[PDB]
Design a protein around this ligand. Structure first.
Ligand SMILES: C=C1C[C@]23C[C@@]1(O)CC[C@H]2[C@@]12C=C[C@H](O)[C@@](C)(C(=O)O1)[C@H]2[C@@H]3C(=O)O
Lengths: 438, 334
C-alpha cells in the first residue's frame, strides 16, 4: 500500500517506509553540508539517475554516490475545419449505422468542403475521405518512402538512439555479443552502436548480427547487401563481425531452433523491435508465440519502440475518432518542416497508414496500435520485467532533438521507466526495455 | 527537527525531496541543469474523459513563442457521453461563470503547467469553486529571463478575453480572476497592472505566498534562515537568475513598492486576496506588500496563517488548506 496523497502527486512511497525515507533525507542534507560543491557537481554531472518516481531507491543511490486516457491538443482553425470534422464524423456514423446511401453523398460533401481549406486539415480530410470511400465501396517503393520518412521526421532517429543506448548499457563487460533484429529494414541503426562498442573501455567485444525481413514480391536479396555494407565498416574499426539473415512472412513463423544460438554463458543476446509488434495483433494467436520465442532465447535485453495511441478498439467509430485525433496531431507537427520531396513522400507514407487503418479489416488490418499500459500488461503476462532507462539516454535524446529540429516543439518525457517522444504536451511514441523476470 | 513538528510526515518528505533535488540542480556560476531538471520532474497528461467531474485539454495559444495553456472544465451533467472535439469548447450554460487564469510557482525556474502538483491543484480549484481554470505554460529563467513570463501572461490574458464560448449570459462578458502561486503571484500582479493600463477588466486577484524581495535584510529573513526549507542563498540565486544583467533587488520586478516603481494611487486595480504563511522567511515582504496595497487606497483582504509553511496547499491534510479554499470560493463567487 502506497501513500495516496503522495501517489496523486507522482511519487511512489510505501506507507510503512515513510519514516525510513524521512531518515534518508536527513542523512542526505548533512552529507551535502559536509561535501560542498565537489559532490554536488559529481551528482549533477557524473551520476546516472533511474526511476525518479520511487524515492527510496533514488535516495539510496544518492547516498551511495555521495560517499482510457484521451489526450487532445487544439490548434487554431476556422469554421471550415469545424464543418469538416462535423462531416467526417457524420460519414463515419453513417457507415457504422449501415446506411451506405447517405455515406456516398456525405463523402462527396467532405471532398467539397475540403476543397476550400488550408493547412494540415486539408491533407488529413483528403486522406480520410479516400479511406472512407474505399471502405464504403468495399462494403457494397516502400524503402524509398521509409528513407524519406527517416529524413523528414524525428521518430526513427529517436527510436534508434534510445534502443542503441539501452543495448550498450546491457552489453557492458562482455566479450561475445549477438543482436537479433525483427525490424532489419535497411540497417540504418547498427553502425552507431558498432562504433560505440569499438570505442569502449577495456576492449570491444565480438559482434554477431541476425536480420529478419518480410518476403519481397520480387524476392530481392537486400539483406545480403545490408550485411556486406555493415561488414565493411565492421572491419574498418577492428571489430570481429559476423552477419546472417532470414526471410519470414510473419514473426509468428519463427522459432529458436532456426536462429542458430550459442550457449548463453558464451554469448550474450539482445533483441530489438522498432514499430513491428503491433502487426502481430491481426493474427489471433501471434503475439503469444513471439513472446514465448523471445523468452526461449533468454536475452539480456529486449528493446521495443511503439506508437502511443489506442487504435485497436472493438468499435469502429471509436477507432475512427481516436485515429483522427492522432493523425491530426501528426500533420500539425509536420506543418513546420520546410517544403521538399521527402516531406511529400512522408505525407504519402502517412496517408497509406491511414488508408490501411480505416479501410481494411481482419488479418488484412495491421496498423493496430496500443498504449503503454496495454503493452505492459501483455509483457508482464508473458513473464518479463521492466528495465528502467537512465538520465543519460534522456540527455542524448534531448540533444539530438535540439540539433535536428531546433524550432519545432518536440519534447521528451520519462514515465514508468520508459521514454516518450511527443509534440508539445501530446505524446507520440514510446521506447522501453525489458528483461527476464526473476 | 524544528520543521518536523509543524507539518505532517508526508508533507515534510515532499518538501525535503524538492529541496535536495533543487540543491543538486543549481550551479555556482549562474548556470542551470535543464536536462536533469526535466528528467526529474513528474508530469501528467490531459484527459478529456471526466474524472471526479473534471476534464482537461490543451490549447496552443501562440506558435512563434510556443505558448500553450491547459483548460479545466466541469463535467457535463446533460451529456453522459464523455466530451470530444466539437464538444470541448461548447458554450457555458450559466448566468455568471467565473474563469481563473492561474500561474504556477517555482521561483521563475522550475515546474510546468503539466506538473503533477499543479494539475491536482487546478482540478481541486475547479471542484471547489465551480469555475473554469486556464493554466499558462510560461518561459523560465535563466534561459528566458525577465520579461518573458510577463509577456506570456499578457498574451494568455488576451486569448482568454477574446473567447466567445466563455462569455456569461448576464452581460455578454468574460468574468476573469487572476491567481498565482509563489512567482505566479508576482506574474499575476504585473499582468493585472498591464490589464488595468489597457482596456481589459479584471475582477479579482488571488496571491498565495507571492514572491517579492528587496535589497535590505528583513528580521524574518535573519531569524528563519534555513529552518523551514528555505535559505537566503537560493533566494539570492533565483533573483540573480531572473533579473536583468547588473541589476539589484530594487528593480520594480522585484520590489513593487521601490522608489523606481510606479505609484498605485488613483489607478484602476482589482480587489486583492493575499495569503501569507507565518513560518516563511520572506513573510515580511508579503506583509509589506499588503500594507502598501492598503495605503494606496486599494481594496485588499489579508489572510495571515501564523503556523503555516510553504506548500501547505499541495496536500489536503491540514486546516490551512480547507480555510484558504473556503475563502477563495467565497471570494470568486461573491
Ligand atoms: C528552492 C526552493 C523553492 C521552493 C522553496 C525552496 O526553498 C524549497 C522547495 C521549493 C518548493 C517546491 C515545490 C513548490 O513549487 C514550492 C512553492 C514549495 O512549496 O516548495 C517551491 C518553493 C518556491 O518555489 O518558492
Amino acid at each position: 500500500m502506497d501513500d495516496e496523497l503522495l501517489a496523486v502527486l507522482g511519487y511512489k512511497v510505501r506507507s510503512s517506509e515513510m519514516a525510513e525515507v524521512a531518515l534518508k533525507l536527513e542523512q542526505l542534507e548533512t552529507m551535502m553540508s559536509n561535501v560542498q560543491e565537489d559532490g554536488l557537481s559529481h551528482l549533477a554531472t557524473d551520476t546516472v539517475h533511474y526511476n525518479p518516481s520511487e524515492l527510496y531507491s533514488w535516495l539510496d543511490n544518492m547516498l551511495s554516490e555521495l560517499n482510457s486516457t484521451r489526450s487532445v491538443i487544439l490548434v487554431d482553425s476556422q469554421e471550415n475545419g469545424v464543418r469538416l470534422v462535423h462531416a467526417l464524423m457524420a460519414c463515419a456514423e453513417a457507415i457504422q449505422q449501415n446506411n451506405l446511401t447517405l455515406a456516398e453523398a456525405l463523402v462527396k460533401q467532405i471532398g467539397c468542403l475540403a476543397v476550400s481549406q488550408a493547412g494540415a486539415m486539408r491533407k488529413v480530410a483528403t486522406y480520410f475521405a479516400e479511406a472512407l470511400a474505399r471502405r464504403i465501396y468495399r462494403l457494397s517503393l516502400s524503402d524509398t518512402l521509409q528513407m524519406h520518412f527517416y529524413e523528414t521526421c524525428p521518430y526513427l532517429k529517436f527510436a534508434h538512439f534510445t534502443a542503441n543506448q539501452a543495448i550498450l548499457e546491457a552489453f557492458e563487460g562482455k566479450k561475445r555479443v549477438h543482436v537479433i533484429d525483427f525490424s532489419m529494414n535497411q540497417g540504418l541503426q547498427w553502425p552507431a552502436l558498432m562504433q560505440a562498442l569499438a570505442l569502449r573501455e577495456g576492449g570491444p567485444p565480438t559482434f554477431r548480427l541476425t536480420g529478419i525481413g518480410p518476403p519481397a514480391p520480387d524476392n530481392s536479396d537486400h539483406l545480403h547487401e545490408v550485411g556486406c555494407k555493415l561488414a565493411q565498416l565492421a572491419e574498418a574499426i577492428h571489430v570481429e563481425f559476423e552477419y546472417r539473415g532470414f526471410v519470414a512472412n510473419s514473426l509468428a513463423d519463427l522459432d529458436a531452433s532456426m536462429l542458430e544460438l550459442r550457449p548463453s554463458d558464451t554469448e550474450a543476446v539482445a533483441v530489438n523491435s522498432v514499430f513491428e509488434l503491433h502487426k502481430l495483433l491481426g493474427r489471433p494467436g501471434g503475439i503469444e508465440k513471439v513472446l514465448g520465442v523471445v523468452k526461449q532465447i533468454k536475452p539480456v535485453i529486449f528493446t521495443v519502440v511503439e506508437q502511443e495511441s489506442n487504435h485497436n478498439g472493438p468499435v469502429f467509430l471509436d477507432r475512427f475518432t481516436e485515429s483522427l485525433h492522432y493523425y491530426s496531431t501528426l500533420f500539425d507537427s509536420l506543418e513546420g518542416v520546410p517544403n521538399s520531396q521527402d516531406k511529400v513522400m512522408s505525407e504519402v507514407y502517412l496517408g497509406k497508414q491511414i488508408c490501411n487503418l480505416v479501410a481494411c479489416e481482419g488479418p488484412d488490418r495491421v496498423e493496430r496500435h496500443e498504449t503503454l499500459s496495454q503493452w505492459g500488461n501483455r509483457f508482464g503476462s508473458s513473464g518479463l520485467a521492466p528495465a528502467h532507462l537512465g538520465s543519460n539516454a534522456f540527455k542524448q535524446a534531448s540533444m539530438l532533438l535540439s540539433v535536428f529540429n531546433s524550432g519545432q516543439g518536440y519534447r521528451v518525457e520519462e514515465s514508468n521507466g520508459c521514454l516518450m517522444l511527443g509534440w508539445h504536451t501530446r505524446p507520440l511514441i514510446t521506447t522501453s526495455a525489458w528483461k527476464l523476470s526473476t | 527537527i524544528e520543521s518536523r513538528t509543524v507539518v505532517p510526515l508526508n508533507t515534510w518528505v515532499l518538501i525535503s525531496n524538492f529541496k535536495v533535488a533543487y540543491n543538486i540542480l543549481r550551479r555556482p556560476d549562474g548556470t542551470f541543469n535543464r536536462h536533469l531538471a526535466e528528467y526529474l520532474d513528474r508530469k501528467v497528461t490531459a484527459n478529456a474523459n471526466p474524472v471526479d467531474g473534471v476534464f482537461s485539454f490543451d490549447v496552443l495559444i501562440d506558435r512563434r513563442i510556443n505558448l500553450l495553456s491547459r483548460v479545466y472544465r466541469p463535467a457535463y451533467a446533460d451529456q453522459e457521453q464523455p466530451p470530444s472535439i466539437l464538444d470541448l469548447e461548447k458554450p457555458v450554460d450559466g448566468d455568471i461563470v467565473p474563469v481563473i487564469l492561474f500561474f504556477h510557482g517555482g521561483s521563475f525556474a522550475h515546474s510546468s503547467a503539466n506538473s503533477a502538483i499543479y494539475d491536482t491543484l487546478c482540478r481541486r480549484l475547479v471542484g471547489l469553486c465551480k469555475c473554469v481554470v486556464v493554466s499558462v505554460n510560461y518561459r523560465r529563467a535563466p534561459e528566458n529571463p525577465y520579461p518573458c513570463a510577463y509577456d506570456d501572461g499578457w498574451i494568455a490574458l488576451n486569448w482568454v478575453n477574446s473567447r466567445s464560448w466563455l462569455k456569461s449570459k448576464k452581460d455578454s462578458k468574460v468574468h476573469i480572476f487572476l491567481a498565482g502561486d509563489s512567482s505566479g503571484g508576482n506574474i499575476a500582479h504585473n499582468v493585472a497592472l498591464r490589464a488595468g493600463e489597457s482596456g481589459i477588466d479584471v475582477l479579482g486577484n488571488i496571491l498565495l505566498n507571492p514572491m517579492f524581495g528587496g535589497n535590505e535584510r528583513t528580521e524574518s529573513e535573519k531569524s528563519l534562515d534555513g529552518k523551514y526549507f528555505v535559505t537566503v542563498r537560493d533566494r539570492d540565486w533565483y533573483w540573480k537568475a531572473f533579473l536583468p544583467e547588473g541589476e539589484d533587488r530594487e528593480h520594480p520586478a522585484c520590489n513593487p513598492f521601490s522608489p523606481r516603481g510606479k505609484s498605485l494611487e488613483g489607478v484602476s486595480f482589482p480587489k486583492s486576496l493575499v495569503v501569507v504563511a507565518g513560518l516563511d522567511l520572506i513573510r515580511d515582504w508579503q506583509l509589506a506588500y499588503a500594507e502598501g496595497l492598503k495605503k494606496a487606497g486599494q481594496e485588499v483582504k489579508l489572510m495571515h496563517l501564523e503556523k503555516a509553511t510553504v506548500g501547505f496547499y499541495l496536500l489536503p491534510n491540514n486546516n490551512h488548506f480547507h480555510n484558504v479554499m473556503d475563502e477563495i470560493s467565497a471570494f470568486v463567487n461573491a
